[PDB]
Design a protein around this ligand. Structure first.
Ligand SMILES: CC(C)[C@H](NC(=O)N(C)Cc1ccccn1)C(=O)N[C@@H](Cc1ccccc1)[C@H](O)[C@H](O)[C@H](Cc1ccccc1)NC(=O)[C@@H](NC(=O)N(C)Cc1ccccn1)C(C)C
Lengths: 99, 99
């Protein structure tokens, strides 16, 4: 699709067999989701942004589907205000910025 | 122009007749710039991000030029690591997300 930015660019993703909403975020390097249980082993990590650092669980090679497009990559889970899709998966689905 | 997302989407902006670099960010509602001393009146404000909140000063009606395109609006100034161009100015330059 072509998404304009008059509203937050929130879409539906599918992950773990669950449906969620997430923000398409060109200003994020990584993908951060709210607390959930995913199958798999995970490692503790830290990530930062405005306000500071949070602790997250890192899951690799996770299948996610973003507007019907498949991506397979690293997902961090932790206490984010919002589900964020970052550049690690935006590139996999062929996302660009245009103006 | 079309910007790919392999790297962070950093572009040149002109503000106050000075050039800076800034991140095009579809996940920011607001525009946040590094500390600098603009003339003008300001309001104090708090904005949040992944790790919590920071204090900023709010300036309205600022002209920024982004890759040749002008935009005019509210800019928040404070102790950010990176200059962030948010949706309030992105919409004005006709910027879209495409995949
Ligand atoms: C999500 C996280 C993994 C990401 N971090 C990240 O990419 N890092 C640390 C790598 C890095 C280092 C140096 C330079 C560039 N990038 C991040 O926070 N990115 C920030 C940019 C940044 C980078 C480093 C330090 C400081 C800032 C980027 O601005 C994101 O788009 C971020 C995403 C987000 C959105 C909502 C709530 C939490 C996080 N937006 C924001 O932090 C903005 N907030 C915002 O727009 N809010 C709170 C309103 C809102 C609410 C709900 C939904 C959308 N918007 C502020 C910049 C204004």
């Amino acid at each position: 699709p072509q998404i304009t930015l008059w509203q937050r660019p929130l879409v539906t993703i599918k992950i773990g067999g669950q449906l969620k909403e997430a923000l398409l975020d060109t200003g994020a390097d990584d993908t951060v989701l709210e607390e959930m249980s995913l199958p798999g082993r995970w490692k503790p990590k830290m990530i930062g942004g405005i306000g500071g650092f949070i602790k997250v669980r890192q899951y690799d090679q996770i299948l996610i589907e973003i507007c019907g497009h498949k991506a397979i990559g690293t997902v961090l889970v932790g206490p984010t205000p919002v589900n964020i899709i970052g550049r690690n998966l935006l590139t996999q689905i062929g996302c660009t910025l245009n103006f």
